[PDB]
Amino acid sequence: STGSATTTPIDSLDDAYITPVQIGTPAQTLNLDFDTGSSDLWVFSSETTASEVDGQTIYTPSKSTTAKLLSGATWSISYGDGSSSSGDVYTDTVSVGGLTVTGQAVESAKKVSSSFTEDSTIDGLLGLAFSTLNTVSPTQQKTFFDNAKASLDSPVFTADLGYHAPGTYNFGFIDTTAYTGSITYTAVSTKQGFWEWTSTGYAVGSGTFKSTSIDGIADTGTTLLYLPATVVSAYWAQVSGAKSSSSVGGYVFPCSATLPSFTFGVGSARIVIPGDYIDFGPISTGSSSCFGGIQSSAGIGINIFGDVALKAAFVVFNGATTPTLGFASK
Ligand SMILES: C#CCN(C)Cc1nc([C@]2(O)CN[C@@H](c3nc(-c4ccc(C(F)(F)F)cc4N)no3)C2)cs1
């Protein structure tokens, strides 16, 4: 089998991408944030505290003839930004772009933190990291991809995120029309449950390439590109007036600037992020200070190839017996 679904930016900055997901019978379509950096499929639901729902579409398991309570199962998750959610668990039929998993664990939120409430466009998350990170207790659950993998034509999914435009998540096949040149595959460590790999270095703008190993994760659920402070400083040093602001929480730059590109290495290949992809716009409405799309990972403990990096590429998440990641230009 295969599936293919369009993913759409939630706003003009590409802060996140939402993909329609069919849950239950008859289908209840919710727009979920596909997150290769986590492993829970959770949704706003008829069980979510009413004051914490503000415009999201909710999953109502009592209206699904295929929903079954996963008795005694609870979940609770906290994300890198400090947001969180928790609740109980149903199993139900879940379909993405024509690909159907029966008995998928659908984690129904009883509580969500303020940042989720405040984002009326995100109805929940669909985790695509390794199932070892799934938070369901006492019986850990598998991700949608893990459940679908054996049925797929090929045990892969691909992320083709758009820049200020929709893109595509495909399951079970590689669309050879969706990229230029070749896909360079690189080794993955699953030891932390992430799609963790080592970039071979970087370049800023038209500068020469600096060979240096950068261990990080391919994370569609993170907006920005988080890299070591040395690399990030070398980038922003090329932008007049750019500086790290403790009050804002990262590097800012004058909105009047044109930004240089940023290249990252995948083996001997190179992915070039155009400068415009690094511009996240005014820090507040009407400000002439703009937020940078490349930020330091120093406080995180891991480098994160988030959407800023991934949307410059066609990315293969290869879930073969030995997982690998593939990157192609597009
Ligand atoms: C600190 C620290 C060390 N490590 C935990 C950092 C890491 N962190 C992660 C993710 O937790 C997993 N992938 C990312 C993700 N973020 C979201 C997300 C989406 C929407 C909203 C909002 F605004 F609507 F509330 C909040 C989110 N947090 N979805 O995925 C972040 C992987 S490594």
mmCIF file of C-alpha atoms and ligand atoms in Angstrom:
data_model
loop_
_atom_site.group_PDB
_atom_site.id
_atom_site.type_symbol
_atom_site.label_atom_id
_atom_site.label_comp_id
_atom_site.label_asym_id
_atom_site.label_seq_id
_atom_site.Cartn_x
_atom_site.Cartn_y
_atom_site.Cartn_z
ATOM 1 C CA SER A 1 0.000 0.000 0.000
ATOM 2 C CA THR A 2 0.866 3.686 -0.187
ATOM 3 C CA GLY A 3 -0.515 6.980 1.024
ATOM 4 C CA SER A 4 -0.023 10.572 -0.052
ATOM 5 C CA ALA A 5 -1.292 13.693 1.688
ATOM 6 C CA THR A 6 -0.754 17.401 1.208
ATOM 7 C CA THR A 7 0.673 19.322 4.142
ATOM 8 C CA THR A 8 -0.074 23.039 4.433
ATOM 9 C CA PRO A 9 1.651 25.811 6.421
ATOM 10 C CA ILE A 10 -0.519 27.076 9.257
ATOM 11 C CA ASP A 11 0.509 30.707 8.677
ATOM 12 C CA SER A 12 2.548 33.009 6.451
ATOM 13 C CA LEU A 13 5.788 32.145 8.285
ATOM 14 C CA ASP A 14 5.649 28.332 7.947
ATOM 15 C CA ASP A 15 5.522 28.074 11.744
ATOM 16 C CA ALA A 16 4.165 24.538 11.355
ATOM 17 C CA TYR A 17 2.453 22.371 8.759
ATOM 18 C CA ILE A 18 -0.889 20.586 9.084
ATOM 19 C CA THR A 19 -1.982 17.473 7.238
ATOM 20 C CA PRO A 20 -5.562 16.143 7.159
ATOM 21 C CA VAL A 21 -5.998 12.793 8.907
ATOM 22 C CA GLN A 22 -9.145 10.660 8.891
ATOM 23 C CA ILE A 23 -9.979 9.119 12.278
ATOM 24 C CA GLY A 24 -12.826 6.758 13.046
ATOM 25 C CA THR A 25 -15.981 5.573 11.316
ATOM 26 C CA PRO A 26 -17.547 7.633 9.786
ATOM 27 C CA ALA A 27 -14.335 9.566 9.209
ATOM 28 C CA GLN A 28 -13.586 12.524 11.448
ATOM 29 C CA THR A 29 -10.984 14.633 9.666
ATOM 30 C CA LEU A 30 -8.524 16.453 11.918
ATOM 31 C CA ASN A 31 -5.559 18.538 10.790
ATOM 32 C CA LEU A 32 -2.510 17.151 12.569
ATOM 33 C CA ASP A 33 1.069 18.368 12.826
ATOM 34 C CA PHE A 34 3.235 15.499 11.533
ATOM 35 C CA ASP A 35 6.196 15.431 13.905
ATOM 36 C CA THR A 36 9.242 13.297 13.120
ATOM 37 C CA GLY A 37 10.609 14.369 16.530
ATOM 38 C CA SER A 38 7.953 12.652 18.657
ATOM 39 C CA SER A 39 6.032 9.406 18.705
ATOM 40 C CA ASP A 40 2.509 10.092 19.989
ATOM 41 C CA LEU A 41 -0.594 10.553 17.864
ATOM 42 C CA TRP A 42 -2.762 12.757 20.050
ATOM 43 C CA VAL A 43 -5.824 14.839 19.278
ATOM 44 C CA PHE A 44 -8.083 17.468 20.703
ATOM 45 C CA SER A 45 -11.203 15.571 21.626
ATOM 46 C CA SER A 46 -14.624 15.610 23.235
ATOM 47 C CA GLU A 47 -12.694 14.867 26.445
ATOM 48 C CA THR A 48 -10.470 17.956 26.281
ATOM 49 C CA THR A 49 -11.158 20.462 29.063
ATOM 50 C CA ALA A 50 -13.585 22.891 27.447
ATOM 51 C CA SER A 51 -11.682 26.023 28.485
ATOM 52 C CA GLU A 52 -8.594 24.644 26.697
ATOM 53 C CA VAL A 53 -10.319 24.239 23.306
ATOM 54 C CA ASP A 54 -10.413 27.373 21.137
ATOM 55 C CA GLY A 55 -11.431 26.588 17.565
ATOM 56 C CA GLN A 56 -9.765 23.209 17.087
ATOM 57 C CA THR A 57 -11.641 20.367 15.453
ATOM 58 C CA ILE A 58 -12.193 17.646 18.051
ATOM 59 C CA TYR A 59 -12.254 13.872 17.785
ATOM 60 C CA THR A 60 -15.365 12.402 19.420
ATOM 61 C CA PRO A 61 -14.729 8.676 20.001
ATOM 62 C CA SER A 62 -18.345 8.058 21.061
ATOM 63 C CA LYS A 63 -19.399 8.884 17.484
ATOM 64 C CA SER A 64 -16.953 6.393 15.929
ATOM 65 C CA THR A 65 -18.247 2.848 15.545
ATOM 66 C CA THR A 66 -14.643 1.565 15.353
ATOM 67 C CA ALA A 67 -13.320 3.359 18.442
ATOM 68 C CA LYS A 68 -12.451 1.254 21.477
ATOM 69 C CA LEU A 69 -11.181 2.536 24.799
ATOM 70 C CA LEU A 70 -7.679 1.224 25.455
ATOM 71 C CA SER A 71 -8.589 0.418 29.031
ATOM 72 C CA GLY A 72 -6.262 1.814 31.683
ATOM 73 C CA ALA A 73 -3.980 3.521 29.169
ATOM 74 C CA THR A 74 -2.888 7.111 29.747
ATOM 75 C CA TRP A 75 -0.351 9.360 28.101
ATOM 76 C CA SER A 76 1.474 12.538 28.986
ATOM 77 C CA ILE A 77 4.002 14.404 26.875
ATOM 78 C CA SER A 78 6.110 17.546 27.134
ATOM 79 C CA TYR A 79 7.756 19.103 24.102
ATOM 80 C CA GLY A 80 10.969 21.034 23.640
ATOM 81 C CA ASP A 81 9.209 24.406 23.887
ATOM 82 C CA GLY A 82 7.644 23.568 27.243
ATOM 83 C CA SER A 83 4.203 22.794 25.845
ATOM 84 C CA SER A 84 2.404 19.679 27.005
ATOM 85 C CA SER A 85 -0.707 17.540 26.769
ATOM 86 C CA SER A 86 -2.078 14.408 28.388
ATOM 87 C CA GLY A 87 -5.109 12.165 28.477
ATOM 88 C CA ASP A 88 -6.406 8.673 27.782
ATOM 89 C CA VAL A 89 -6.265 6.402 24.753
ATOM 90 C CA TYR A 90 -8.588 4.875 22.186
ATOM 91 C CA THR A 91 -7.793 2.591 19.319
ATOM 92 C CA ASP A 92 -9.445 3.482 16.039
ATOM 93 C CA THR A 93 -9.017 3.421 12.291
ATOM 94 C CA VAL A 94 -6.666 6.151 11.066
ATOM 95 C CA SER A 95 -6.100 7.025 7.414
ATOM 96 C CA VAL A 96 -3.574 9.401 5.869
ATOM 97 C CA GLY A 97 -3.877 10.145 2.189
ATOM 98 C CA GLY A 98 -5.498 6.802 1.385
ATOM 99 C CA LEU A 99 -3.289 4.675 3.682
ATOM 100 C CA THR A 100 -5.288 3.034 6.479
ATOM 101 C CA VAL A 101 -4.198 1.595 9.828
ATOM 102 C CA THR A 102 -6.779 -0.223 11.912
ATOM 103 C CA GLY A 103 -6.289 -0.338 15.660
ATOM 104 C CA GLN A 104 -4.071 2.741 15.752
ATOM 105 C CA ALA A 105 -3.611 4.242 19.206
ATOM 106 C CA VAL A 106 -5.354 7.625 19.158
ATOM 107 C CA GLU A 107 -4.402 9.538 22.285
ATOM 108 C CA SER A 108 -7.309 11.713 23.361
ATOM 109 C CA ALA A 109 -6.294 14.901 25.155
ATOM 110 C CA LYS A 110 -7.957 15.648 28.451
ATOM 111 C CA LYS A 111 -5.559 18.561 29.022
ATOM 112 C CA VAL A 112 -3.430 20.695 26.712
ATOM 113 C CA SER A 113 -1.136 23.570 27.567
ATOM 114 C CA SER A 114 -1.742 27.158 26.524
ATOM 115 C CA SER A 115 0.313 27.121 23.313
ATOM 116 C CA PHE A 116 -1.843 24.318 21.933
ATOM 117 C CA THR A 117 -5.076 26.073 22.913
ATOM 118 C CA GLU A 118 -3.798 29.263 21.273
ATOM 119 C CA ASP A 119 -3.138 27.503 17.932
ATOM 120 C CA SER A 120 -6.635 26.999 16.524
ATOM 121 C CA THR A 121 -5.225 25.455 13.317
ATOM 122 C CA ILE A 122 -3.505 22.432 14.920
ATOM 123 C CA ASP A 123 -5.937 19.700 15.998
ATOM 124 C CA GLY A 124 -3.202 17.451 17.373
ATOM 125 C CA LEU A 125 0.090 15.798 16.515
ATOM 126 C CA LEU A 126 0.996 12.679 14.546
ATOM 127 C CA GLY A 127 4.354 11.446 15.777
ATOM 128 C CA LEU A 128 6.748 9.863 13.292
ATOM 129 C CA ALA A 129 9.835 9.297 15.434
ATOM 130 C CA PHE A 130 10.583 5.801 16.708
ATOM 131 C CA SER A 131 7.941 4.115 18.830
ATOM 132 C CA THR A 132 10.379 3.770 21.738
ATOM 133 C CA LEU A 133 9.534 7.431 22.508
ATOM 134 C CA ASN A 134 5.774 6.836 22.718
ATOM 135 C CA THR A 135 4.437 7.927 26.102
ATOM 136 C CA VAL A 136 1.428 5.614 26.485
ATOM 137 C CA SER A 137 1.473 3.758 29.813
ATOM 138 C CA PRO A 138 1.388 0.984 30.907
ATOM 139 C CA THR A 139 1.480 -0.474 27.353
ATOM 140 C CA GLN A 140 3.590 1.609 24.977
ATOM 141 C CA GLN A 141 1.974 2.127 21.573
ATOM 142 C CA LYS A 142 3.294 2.201 18.020
ATOM 143 C CA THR A 143 3.307 5.181 15.704
ATOM 144 C CA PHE A 144 1.132 5.320 12.604
ATOM 145 C CA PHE A 145 4.215 4.655 10.461
ATOM 146 C CA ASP A 146 5.349 1.741 12.634
ATOM 147 C CA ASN A 147 1.882 0.174 12.348
ATOM 148 C CA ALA A 148 1.681 0.748 8.586
ATOM 149 C CA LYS A 149 5.278 -0.181 7.752
ATOM 150 C CA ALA A 150 4.826 -3.886 7.000
ATOM 151 C CA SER A 151 1.905 -3.178 4.642
ATOM 152 C CA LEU A 152 3.682 -0.464 2.651
ATOM 153 C CA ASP A 153 5.221 -1.116 -0.748
ATOM 154 C CA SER A 154 8.497 0.146 0.739
ATOM 155 C CA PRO A 155 9.049 0.808 4.482
ATOM 156 C CA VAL A 156 9.591 4.547 4.022
ATOM 157 C CA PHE A 157 7.894 7.888 4.266
ATOM 158 C CA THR A 158 8.999 11.143 2.676
ATOM 159 C CA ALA A 159 8.676 14.785 3.700
ATOM 160 C CA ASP A 160 8.549 17.411 0.950
ATOM 161 C CA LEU A 161 7.738 20.598 2.835
ATOM 162 C CA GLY A 162 6.989 23.764 0.909
ATOM 163 C CA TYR A 163 8.398 27.235 1.421
ATOM 164 C CA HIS A 164 5.372 29.457 2.076
ATOM 165 C CA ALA A 165 3.437 26.835 0.124
ATOM 166 C CA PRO A 166 1.909 23.379 0.589
ATOM 167 C CA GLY A 167 3.963 20.230 0.345
ATOM 168 C CA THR A 168 3.545 16.488 0.542
ATOM 169 C CA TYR A 169 3.960 13.559 2.924
ATOM 170 C CA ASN A 170 4.143 10.244 1.090
ATOM 171 C CA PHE A 171 4.078 6.807 2.686
ATOM 172 C CA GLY A 172 5.420 3.665 1.084
ATOM 173 C CA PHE A 173 7.025 5.065 -2.052
ATOM 174 C CA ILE A 174 9.556 7.585 -3.312
ATOM 175 C CA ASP A 175 8.208 10.084 -5.860
ATOM 176 C CA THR A 176 11.144 10.361 -8.262
ATOM 177 C CA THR A 177 9.587 13.436 -9.899
ATOM 178 C CA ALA A 178 9.697 15.391 -6.627
ATOM 179 C CA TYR A 179 13.441 16.093 -6.456
ATOM 180 C CA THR A 180 16.434 16.977 -8.607
ATOM 181 C CA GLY A 181 19.664 15.020 -8.847
ATOM 182 C CA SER A 182 20.090 12.028 -6.560
ATOM 183 C CA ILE A 183 19.077 11.228 -2.989
ATOM 184 C CA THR A 184 22.076 10.944 -0.679
ATOM 185 C CA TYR A 185 21.440 8.497 2.135
ATOM 186 C CA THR A 186 23.130 8.833 5.494
ATOM 187 C CA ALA A 187 23.264 6.660 8.591
ATOM 188 C CA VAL A 188 20.704 7.005 11.387
ATOM 189 C CA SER A 189 21.079 6.318 15.093
ATOM 190 C CA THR A 190 17.855 5.315 16.834
ATOM 191 C CA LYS A 191 19.523 5.271 20.265
ATOM 192 C CA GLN A 192 17.617 8.377 21.402
ATOM 193 C CA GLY A 193 14.431 7.438 19.533
ATOM 194 C CA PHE A 194 14.931 10.163 16.907
ATOM 195 C CA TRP A 195 15.878 10.262 13.238
ATOM 196 C CA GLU A 196 19.379 11.201 14.354
ATOM 197 C CA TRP A 197 22.163 11.624 11.810
ATOM 198 C CA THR A 198 25.456 13.460 11.329
ATOM 199 C CA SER A 199 25.778 16.308 8.877
ATOM 200 C CA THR A 200 29.228 16.646 7.323
ATOM 201 C CA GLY A 201 29.507 20.422 7.644
ATOM 202 C CA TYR A 202 28.218 23.730 6.431
ATOM 203 C CA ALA A 203 28.808 26.830 4.353
ATOM 204 C CA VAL A 204 27.470 30.372 4.658
ATOM 205 C CA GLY A 205 26.383 32.128 1.480
ATOM 206 C CA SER A 206 29.002 31.817 -1.245
ATOM 207 C CA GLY A 207 31.683 30.848 1.259
ATOM 208 C CA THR A 208 33.738 27.696 1.213
ATOM 209 C CA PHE A 209 32.555 24.544 2.948
ATOM 210 C CA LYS A 210 33.615 23.859 6.546
ATOM 211 C CA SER A 211 33.944 20.117 7.122
ATOM 212 C CA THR A 212 32.723 19.349 10.642
ATOM 213 C CA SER A 213 30.459 16.663 12.067
ATOM 214 C CA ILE A 214 27.105 17.989 13.277
ATOM 215 C CA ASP A 215 25.002 15.363 15.035
ATOM 216 C CA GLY A 216 21.334 16.274 15.009
ATOM 217 C CA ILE A 217 17.800 15.120 14.342
ATOM 218 C CA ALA A 218 15.527 15.529 11.331
ATOM 219 C CA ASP A 219 12.438 17.026 12.993
ATOM 220 C CA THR A 220 9.432 18.132 10.945
ATOM 221 C CA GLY A 221 7.758 19.292 14.153
ATOM 222 C CA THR A 222 10.387 21.956 14.888
ATOM 223 C CA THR A 223 10.076 25.229 12.981
ATOM 224 C CA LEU A 224 13.699 26.409 12.927
ATOM 225 C CA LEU A 225 17.225 25.106 12.375
ATOM 226 C CA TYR A 226 19.124 24.724 15.665
ATOM 227 C CA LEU A 227 22.890 24.319 15.339
ATOM 228 C CA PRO A 228 25.962 24.721 17.553
ATOM 229 C CA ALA A 229 26.660 28.248 18.741
ATOM 230 C CA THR A 230 29.901 28.387 16.738
ATOM 231 C CA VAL A 231 28.080 27.652 13.471
ATOM 232 C CA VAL A 232 25.208 30.008 14.245
ATOM 233 C CA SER A 233 27.580 32.846 15.133
ATOM 234 C CA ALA A 234 29.503 32.321 11.878
ATOM 235 C CA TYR A 235 26.222 32.638 9.971
ATOM 236 C CA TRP A 236 24.834 35.743 11.688
ATOM 237 C CA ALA A 237 28.220 37.484 11.582
ATOM 238 C CA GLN A 238 27.561 37.878 7.846
ATOM 239 C CA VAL A 239 24.393 39.946 8.435
ATOM 240 C CA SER A 240 24.960 43.583 9.389
ATOM 241 C CA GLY A 241 23.174 44.368 12.634
ATOM 242 C CA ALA A 242 22.343 40.768 13.517
ATOM 243 C CA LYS A 243 22.822 39.861 17.156
ATOM 244 C CA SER A 244 21.609 37.448 19.789
ATOM 245 C CA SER A 245 18.935 39.009 21.999
ATOM 246 C CA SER A 246 18.343 37.437 25.394
ATOM 247 C CA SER A 247 15.071 39.362 25.744
ATOM 248 C CA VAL A 248 13.741 38.071 22.422
ATOM 249 C CA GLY A 249 15.184 34.578 22.840
ATOM 250 C CA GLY A 250 17.567 34.250 19.912
ATOM 251 C CA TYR A 251 19.265 35.898 16.991
ATOM 252 C CA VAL A 252 17.433 38.856 15.475
ATOM 253 C CA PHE A 253 18.407 40.879 12.437
ATOM 254 C CA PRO A 254 17.274 44.074 10.699
ATOM 255 C CA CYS A 255 14.247 43.380 8.539
ATOM 256 C CA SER A 256 15.939 45.521 5.863
ATOM 257 C CA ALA A 257 18.628 42.837 5.425
ATOM 258 C CA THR A 258 18.862 40.289 2.639
ATOM 259 C CA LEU A 259 20.059 37.060 4.206
ATOM 260 C CA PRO A 260 22.782 34.758 2.892
ATOM 261 C CA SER A 261 22.028 31.154 2.116
ATOM 262 C CA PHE A 262 23.106 28.353 4.434
ATOM 263 C CA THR A 263 24.427 25.044 3.106
ATOM 264 C CA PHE A 264 24.538 21.818 5.098
ATOM 265 C CA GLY A 265 26.389 18.649 4.163
ATOM 266 C CA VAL A 266 24.784 15.237 3.702
ATOM 267 C CA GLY A 267 27.727 12.951 3.110
ATOM 268 C CA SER A 268 29.482 14.415 0.096
ATOM 269 C CA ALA A 269 26.278 16.128 -1.080
ATOM 270 C CA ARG A 270 24.989 19.580 -0.178
ATOM 271 C CA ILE A 271 21.574 21.044 0.636
ATOM 272 C CA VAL A 272 21.362 24.810 0.115
ATOM 273 C CA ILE A 273 18.822 26.705 2.231
ATOM 274 C CA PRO A 274 18.043 30.003 0.448
ATOM 275 C CA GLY A 275 18.490 33.099 2.569
ATOM 276 C CA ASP A 276 14.798 33.948 2.388
ATOM 277 C CA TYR A 277 13.956 30.696 4.197
ATOM 278 C CA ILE A 278 15.872 32.012 7.229
ATOM 279 C CA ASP A 279 13.674 35.127 7.567
ATOM 280 C CA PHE A 280 10.914 34.638 10.149
ATOM 281 C CA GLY A 281 9.658 38.193 10.004
ATOM 282 C CA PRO A 282 9.119 40.911 12.581
ATOM 283 C CA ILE A 283 9.510 39.870 16.209
ATOM 284 C CA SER A 284 6.197 41.656 16.843
ATOM 285 C CA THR A 285 3.752 43.308 14.465
ATOM 286 C CA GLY A 286 5.268 46.403 12.890
ATOM 287 C CA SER A 287 8.764 45.829 14.258
ATOM 288 C CA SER A 288 11.789 46.327 12.050
ATOM 289 C CA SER A 289 13.626 43.634 14.005
ATOM 290 C CA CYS A 290 13.202 40.208 12.425
ATOM 291 C CA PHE A 291 13.630 36.767 13.961
ATOM 292 C CA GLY A 292 16.270 34.466 12.525
ATOM 293 C CA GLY A 293 15.540 30.975 11.254
ATOM 294 C CA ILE A 294 18.935 29.647 12.365
ATOM 295 C CA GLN A 295 19.351 29.575 16.136
ATOM 296 C CA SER A 296 21.723 28.113 18.681
ATOM 297 C CA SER A 297 21.127 24.608 20.019
ATOM 298 C CA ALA A 298 23.343 25.335 23.033
ATOM 299 C CA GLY A 299 20.515 25.183 25.561
ATOM 300 C CA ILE A 300 18.765 22.210 23.928
ATOM 301 C CA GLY A 301 21.382 19.454 24.149
ATOM 302 C CA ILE A 302 20.853 18.355 20.540
ATOM 303 C CA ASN A 303 21.002 19.946 17.114
ATOM 304 C CA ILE A 304 17.673 20.056 15.290
ATOM 305 C CA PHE A 305 17.274 20.084 11.513
ATOM 306 C CA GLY A 306 13.783 21.548 11.669
ATOM 307 C CA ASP A 307 11.528 22.840 8.930
ATOM 308 C CA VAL A 308 13.937 25.605 7.861
ATOM 309 C CA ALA A 309 16.400 22.921 6.780
ATOM 310 C CA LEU A 310 13.989 20.172 5.764
ATOM 311 C CA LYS A 311 11.873 22.360 3.483
ATOM 312 C CA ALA A 312 14.962 22.978 1.353
ATOM 313 C CA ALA A 313 15.097 19.248 0.597
ATOM 314 C CA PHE A 314 13.187 16.163 -0.362
ATOM 315 C CA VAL A 315 13.705 13.976 2.709
ATOM 316 C CA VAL A 316 13.376 10.188 2.884
ATOM 317 C CA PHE A 317 12.713 8.615 6.284
ATOM 318 C CA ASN A 318 13.761 5.044 5.518
ATOM 319 C CA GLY A 319 12.383 2.666 8.133
ATOM 320 C CA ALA A 320 14.098 -0.449 6.824
ATOM 321 C CA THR A 321 15.620 -2.888 9.312
ATOM 322 C CA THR A 322 18.581 -0.499 9.488
ATOM 323 C CA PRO A 323 16.973 2.959 9.231
ATOM 324 C CA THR A 324 18.587 5.685 7.159
ATOM 325 C CA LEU A 325 17.785 9.224 6.068
ATOM 326 C CA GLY A 326 17.908 10.450 2.487
ATOM 327 C CA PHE A 327 18.205 14.051 1.302
ATOM 328 C CA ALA A 328 17.834 15.412 -2.217
ATOM 329 C CA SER A 329 17.753 18.933 -3.557
ATOM 330 C CA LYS A 330 14.529 20.030 -5.205
HETATM 331 C C1 LIG B 1 14.491 21.351 25.273
HETATM 332 C C2 LIG B 1 14.971 20.332 24.899
HETATM 333 C C3 LIG B 1 15.588 19.017 24.423
HETATM 334 N N1 LIG B 1 14.692 18.314 23.522
HETATM 335 C C4 LIG B 1 13.462 17.995 24.223
HETATM 336 C C5 LIG B 1 14.399 19.144 22.365
HETATM 337 C C6 LIG B 1 13.485 18.375 21.416
HETATM 338 N N2 LIG B 1 12.208 18.615 21.200
HETATM 339 C C7 LIG B 1 11.570 17.838 20.346
HETATM 340 C C8 LIG B 1 10.026 18.084 20.047
HETATM 341 O O1 LIG B 1 9.310 18.042 21.250
HETATM 342 C C9 LIG B 1 9.523 17.182 19.152
HETATM 343 N N3 LIG B 1 9.247 17.973 17.746
HETATM 344 C C10 LIG B 1 9.119 19.271 18.047
HETATM 345 C C11 LIG B 1 7.630 19.616 18.003
HETATM 346 N N4 LIG B 1 7.071 20.713 18.481
HETATM 347 C C12 LIG B 1 5.767 20.681 18.257
HETATM 348 C C13 LIG B 1 4.850 21.659 18.618
HETATM 349 C C14 LIG B 1 3.837 22.001 17.736
HETATM 350 C C15 LIG B 1 2.913 22.976 18.079
HETATM 351 C C16 LIG B 1 3.013 23.614 19.305
HETATM 352 C C17 LIG B 1 2.012 24.692 19.710
HETATM 353 F F1 LIG B 1 2.585 25.921 19.563
HETATM 354 F F2 LIG B 1 0.887 24.605 18.943
HETATM 355 F F3 LIG B 1 1.681 24.513 21.019
HETATM 356 C C18 LIG B 1 4.023 23.273 20.186
HETATM 357 C C19 LIG B 1 4.943 22.297 19.845
HETATM 358 N N5 LIG B 1 5.993 21.959 20.786
HETATM 359 N N6 LIG B 1 5.482 19.565 17.612
HETATM 360 O O2 LIG B 1 6.652 18.886 17.445
HETATM 361 C C20 LIG B 1 9.874 19.494 19.420
HETATM 362 C C21 LIG B 1 12.315 16.831 19.749
HETATM 363 S S1 LIG B 1 13.895 17.023 20.428
#
